[PDB]
Design an enzyme around this catalytic site. Structure first.
Site, PDB file in Angstrom:
ATOM      1  N   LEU A 183       0.806  -1.218   0.000  1.00 59.85           N
ATOM      2  CA  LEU A 183       0.000   0.000   0.000  1.00 59.85           C
ATOM      3  C   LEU A 183       0.839   1.269   0.000  1.00 59.85           C
ATOM      4  O   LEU A 183       0.446   2.283  -0.578  1.00 59.85           O
ATOM      5  CB  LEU A 183      -0.938   0.016   1.210  1.00 59.85           C
ATOM      6  CG  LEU A 183      -1.870  -1.184   1.361  1.00 59.85           C
ATOM      7  CD1 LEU A 183      -2.627  -1.096   2.676  1.00 59.85           C
ATOM      8  CD2 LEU A 183      -2.832  -1.261   0.187  1.00 59.85           C
ATOM      9  N   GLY A 184       1.992   1.218   0.658  1.00 53.08           N
ATOM     10  CA  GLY A 184       2.864   2.380   0.753  1.00 53.08           C
ATOM     11  C   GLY A 184       4.288   2.034   1.136  1.00 53.08           C
ATOM     12  O   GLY A 184       4.547   0.996   1.744  1.00 53.08           O
ATOM     13  N   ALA A 185       5.214   2.908   0.770  1.00 50.71           N
ATOM     14  CA  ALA A 185       6.615   2.741   1.142  1.00 50.71           C
ATOM     15  C   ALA A 185       7.184   4.065   1.644  1.00 50.71           C
ATOM     16  O   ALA A 185       6.519   5.099   1.565  1.00 50.71           O
ATOM     17  CB  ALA A 185       7.420   2.219  -0.036  1.00 50.71           C
ATOM     18  N   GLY A 186       8.408   4.032   2.159  1.00 46.27           N
ATOM     19  CA  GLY A 186       9.029   5.229   2.688  1.00 46.27           C
ATOM     20  C   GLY A 186      10.376   4.980   3.341  1.00 46.27           C
ATOM     21  O   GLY A 186      10.909   3.871   3.298  1.00 46.27           O
ATOM     22  N   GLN A 187      10.922   6.021   3.959  1.00 45.01           N
ATOM     23  CA  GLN A 187      12.252   5.950   4.549  1.00 45.01           C
ATOM     24  C   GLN A 187      12.442   4.739   5.460  1.00 45.01           C
ATOM     25  O   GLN A 187      13.538   4.182   5.538  1.00 45.01           O
ATOM     26  CB  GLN A 187      12.575   7.234   5.325  1.00 45.01           C
ATOM     27  CG  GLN A 187      13.957   7.219   5.973  1.00 45.01           C
ATOM     28  CD  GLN A 187      14.273   8.484   6.754  1.00 45.01           C
ATOM     29  OE1 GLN A 187      13.573   9.491   6.646  1.00 45.01           O
ATOM     30  NE2 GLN A 187      15.339   8.435   7.549  1.00 45.01           N
ATOM     31  N   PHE A 188      11.377   4.324   6.137  1.00 46.86           N
ATOM     32  CA  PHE A 188      11.514   3.355   7.225  1.00 46.86           C
ATOM     33  C   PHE A 188      10.924   1.965   6.984  1.00 46.86           C
ATOM     34  O   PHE A 188      11.164   1.041   7.762  1.00 46.86           O
ATOM     35  CB  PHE A 188      10.977   3.954   8.523  1.00 46.86           C
ATOM     36  CG  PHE A 188      11.791   5.105   9.024  1.00 46.86           C
ATOM     37  CD1 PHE A 188      11.400   6.411   8.776  1.00 46.86           C
ATOM     38  CD2 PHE A 188      12.968   4.880   9.718  1.00 46.86           C
ATOM     39  CE1 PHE A 188      12.161   7.472   9.231  1.00 46.86           C
ATOM     40  CE2 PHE A 188      13.732   5.934  10.174  1.00 46.86           C
ATOM     41  CZ  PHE A 188      13.329   7.233   9.931  1.00 46.86           C
ATOM     42  N   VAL A 191       4.035  -0.570   4.071  1.00 49.22           N
ATOM     43  CA  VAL A 191       2.800  -1.053   4.669  1.00 49.22           C
ATOM     44  C   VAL A 191       2.080  -1.901   3.637  1.00 49.22           C
ATOM     45  O   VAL A 191       1.850  -1.467   2.506  1.00 49.22           O
ATOM     46  CB  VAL A 191       1.870   0.092   5.121  1.00 49.22           C
ATOM     47  CG1 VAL A 191       0.457  -0.429   5.357  1.00 49.22           C
ATOM     48  CG2 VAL A 191       2.405   0.760   6.372  1.00 49.22           C
ATOM     49  N   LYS A 205       2.975  -3.339   8.833  1.00 45.27           N
ATOM     50  CA  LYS A 205       4.064  -2.386   8.675  1.00 45.27           C
ATOM     51  C   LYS A 205       5.398  -3.091   8.862  1.00 45.27           C
ATOM     52  O   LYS A 205       5.757  -3.499   9.972  1.00 45.27           O
ATOM     53  CB  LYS A 205       3.936  -1.206   9.643  1.00 45.27           C
ATOM     54  CG  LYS A 205       5.065  -0.195   9.496  1.00 45.27           C
ATOM     55  CD  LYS A 205       4.748   1.138  10.167  1.00 45.27           C
ATOM     56  CE  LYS A 205       3.634   1.880   9.445  1.00 45.27           C
ATOM     57  NZ  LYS A 205       3.765   3.356   9.615  1.00 45.27           N
ATOM     58  N   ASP A 296       4.091  12.372  16.604  1.00 39.63           N
ATOM     59  CA  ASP A 296       3.949  12.588  15.165  1.00 39.63           C
ATOM     60  C   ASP A 296       2.486  12.632  14.736  1.00 39.63           C
ATOM     61  O   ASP A 296       2.035  11.828  13.920  1.00 39.63           O
ATOM     62  CB  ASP A 296       4.729  11.540  14.365  1.00 39.63           C
ATOM     63  CG  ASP A 296       5.016  11.992  12.945  1.00 39.63           C
ATOM     64  OD1 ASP A 296       4.694  13.155  12.615  1.00 39.63           O
ATOM     65  OD2 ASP A 296       5.571  11.190  12.164  1.00 39.63           O
TER      66      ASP A 296
HETATM   67  N1  LIG Z   1      -3.321  -0.535   9.269  1.00 48.31           N
HETATM   68  C1  LIG Z   1      -3.567   0.031   8.065  1.00 48.31           C
HETATM   69  N2  LIG Z   1      -4.685  -0.306   7.379  1.00 48.31           N
HETATM   70  C2  LIG Z   1      -4.951   0.240   6.186  1.00 48.31           C
HETATM   71  N3  LIG Z   1      -4.123   1.130   5.641  1.00 48.31           N
HETATM   72  C3  LIG Z   1      -2.990   1.511   6.284  1.00 48.31           C
HETATM   73  C4  LIG Z   1      -2.689   0.961   7.524  1.00 48.31           C
HETATM   74  C5  LIG Z   1      -1.490   1.532   7.948  1.00 48.31           C
HETATM   75  C6  LIG Z   1      -0.700   1.271   9.193  1.00 48.31           C
HETATM   76  C7  LIG Z   1      -0.354  -0.042   9.482  1.00 48.31           C
HETATM   77  C8  LIG Z   1       0.403  -0.345  10.608  1.00 48.31           C
HETATM   78  C9  LIG Z   1       0.861   0.658  11.442  1.00 48.31           C
HETATM   79  O1  LIG Z   1       1.609   0.302  12.537  1.00 48.31           O
HETATM   80  C10 LIG Z   1       1.466   0.868  13.776  1.00 48.31           C
HETATM   81  C11 LIG Z   1       0.209   1.025  14.342  1.00 48.31           C
HETATM   82  C12 LIG Z   1       0.073   1.604  15.598  1.00 48.31           C
HETATM   83  C13 LIG Z   1       1.203   2.028  16.286  1.00 48.31           C
HETATM   84  C14 LIG Z   1       2.466   1.872  15.719  1.00 48.31           C
HETATM   85  C15 LIG Z   1       2.598   1.295  14.463  1.00 48.31           C
HETATM   86  C16 LIG Z   1       0.539   1.982  11.148  1.00 48.31           C
HETATM   87  C17 LIG Z   1      -0.228   2.290  10.020  1.00 48.31           C
HETATM   88  C18 LIG Z   1      -1.098   2.400   6.937  1.00 48.31           C
HETATM   89  N4  LIG Z   1      -2.015   2.385   5.959  1.00 48.31           N
HETATM   90  C19 LIG Z   1      -1.941   3.194   4.713  1.00 48.31           C
HETATM   91  C20 LIG Z   1      -0.730   2.772   3.885  1.00 48.31           C
HETATM   92  C21 LIG Z   1       0.057   4.006   3.453  1.00 48.31           C
HETATM   93  O2  LIG Z   1      -0.859   4.939   2.871  1.00 48.31           O
HETATM   94  C22 LIG Z   1      -1.687   5.561   3.869  1.00 48.31           C
HETATM   95  C23 LIG Z   1      -1.808   4.662   5.101  1.00 48.31           C
END
Ligand SMILES: Nc1ncnc2c1c(-c1ccc(Oc3ccccc3)cc1)cn2C1CCOCC1
Ligand SMILES: [Ca+2]
Ligand SMILES: [Cl-]
Length: 430
Positions: A183-188, A191, A205, A296
């Site tokens: 779904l997405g990429a980046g520096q770290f 996802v 992630k 953040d």
């Molecule tokens: N969990 C998700 N479900 C659907 N889409 C998601 C995520 C997440 C996501 C998944 C895991 C995550 O990990 C965490 C969660 C809570 C605390 C720390 C890390 C954070 C965001 C991102 N994204 C998109 C992918 C990049 O484009 C816009 C956001």
């Protein structure tokens, strides 16, 4: 001998859980939290059921018009969700008057639009019409409003709860996962949309090996696990072998940032935008309560679910890591002073982000340009779509002194009832 009843249908997807239908009664054998051991009276099979899928029989939860543990605002959110109609109602645990109950009825105010009125209940509402059980009470107001904004028609559309995560499976083997689409990429890291054991849709992630120690990260992730709330994205599981994977619930409409820029986003009217930030304030108020910090806060790190429920993501991740100065408080930029108050500064920016359908903060300005701009006492001007009173909040979040900025508790409290005068929260009956 404790008998429970199925509130919703359930299909088993693990080795030793039971499939049941709405109504199937069951004998409780163990209470291990999210999962209970039970015996279907319909199948005679003994297995595990999701505790939050059933309630003791003849108990209130069994009723279709009752909603356990719901706040007034959420009660108002579920009555304005599509599928309900004028007259749609519900009874719930009252927030203010503990141990008592309150009535929430859908309504149309020709001057506001679709609204939700609330009444307390001591049982009786109006000492005029007294009643023996909520059932009697309910069925009464169903014919001709006895002074109520409207007449009780159909119980409130109830959702099907999320299935609890596999029993005792916080850490999973990577093989349990298929990361199907990125779904997405980046520096770290990236996802991914993933499936866990051929059965459960989830998000992953993946964390590029930094350091950012692994056993350092895992310490945080175990705290992260305990920060559960309807407005925090839910951590399901973790793979502890570099490269580390964080498994969370899958949020359909992606980031708030991306949603506000899209078609469906552009249609959202202002009261909706306000509600969004109200939900985020609720999440931030929880984090504040638990003495935690986000570090953040911004639209990119807010997820939107299929039904337009906002949930904060990446909470804490900021700490454990290893360039968004436009969302960062001067004190956090100048001395790295990250606190809940600097989050509040962030909320102010994120708030402008929302009201401007995701437009970048300080448009046309560089990071350096802005850093000096703030030192001169510069703030973003009110956009046109933005109510004066909403802007005053952003400004309060952007007070030079952290100490002077409001709490999320207060911000939540204000945004929730933005259109409702305090005196108008509950109804006074004739
Ligand atoms: N969990 C998700 N479900 C659907 N889409 C998601 C995520 C997440 C996501 C998944 C895991 C995550 O990990 C965490 C969660 C809570 C605390 C720390 C890390 C954070 C965001 C991102 N994204 C998109 C992918 C990049 O484009 C816009 C956001
Ligand atoms: Ca106004
Ligand atoms: Cl039996």
């Amino acid at each position: 001998r404790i008998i429970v009843v199925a509130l919703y249908d359930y299909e088993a997807i693990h080795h030793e859980d039971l499939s049941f239908q709405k109504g199937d009664q069951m004998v409780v054998l163990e209470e291990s939290g999210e999962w209970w051991k039970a015996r279907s009276l319909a199948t005679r099979k003994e297995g595990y059921i999701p505790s939050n899928y059933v309630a003791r029989v003849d108990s209130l939860e069994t009723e279709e018009w009752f909603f356990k543990g719901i706040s007034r605002k959420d009660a108002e959110r579920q009555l304005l969700a599509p599928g309900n109609m004028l007259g749609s109602f519900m009874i719930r645990d009252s927030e203010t008057t503990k141990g008592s109950y309150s009535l929430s009825v859908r309504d149309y105010d020709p001057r506001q639009g679709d609204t939700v009125k609330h009444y307390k209940i001591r049982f009786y509402i109006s000492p005029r019409s007294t009643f023996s059980t909520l059932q009697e009470l309910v069925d009464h107001y169903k014919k001709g409003n006895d002074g109520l904004c409207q007449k009780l028609s159909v119980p409130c559309m109830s959702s099907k709860p999320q299935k609890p995560w596999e029993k005792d499976a916080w850490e999973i083997p990577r093989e349990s996962l298929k990361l199907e689409k990125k779904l997405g990429a980046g520096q770290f890291g990236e996802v991914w949309m993933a499936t866990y054991n051929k059965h459960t849709k989830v998000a992953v992630k993946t964390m590029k090996p930094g350091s950012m120690s692994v056993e350092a990260f895992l310490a945080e992730a175990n705290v992260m696990k305990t920060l559960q709330h309807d407005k925090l994205v839910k951590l399901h599981a973790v793979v502890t072998k570099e490269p580390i994977y964080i498994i969370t619930e899958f949020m359909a409409k992606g980031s708030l940032l991306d949603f506000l820029k899209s078609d469906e986003g552009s249609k959202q009217p202002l009261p909706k935008l306000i509600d969004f930030s109200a939900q985020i304030a609720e999440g931030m108020a929880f984090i504040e309560q638990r003495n935690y910090i986000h570090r953040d806060l911004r639209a990119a790190n807010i997820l939107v679910s299929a039904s337009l429920v906002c949930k904060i993501a990446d909470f804490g991740l900021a700490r454990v890591i290893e360039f968004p100065i436009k969302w960062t408080a001067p004190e956090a930029i100048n001395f790295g002073s990250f606190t809940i108050k600097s989050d509040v500064w962030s909320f102010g920016i994120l708030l402008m982000e929302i009201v401007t359908y995701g437009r970048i903060p300080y448009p046309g300005m560089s990071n350096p340009e802005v850093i000096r701009a703030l030192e001169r006492g510069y703030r973003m001007p009110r956009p046109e779509n933005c109510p004066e009173e909403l802007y005053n909040i952003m400004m309060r979040c952007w007070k030079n002194r952290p100490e002077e900025r409001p709490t999320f508790e207060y911000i939540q409290s204000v945004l929730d009832d933005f259109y409702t005068a305090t005196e108008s929260q509950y109804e006074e009956i004739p």
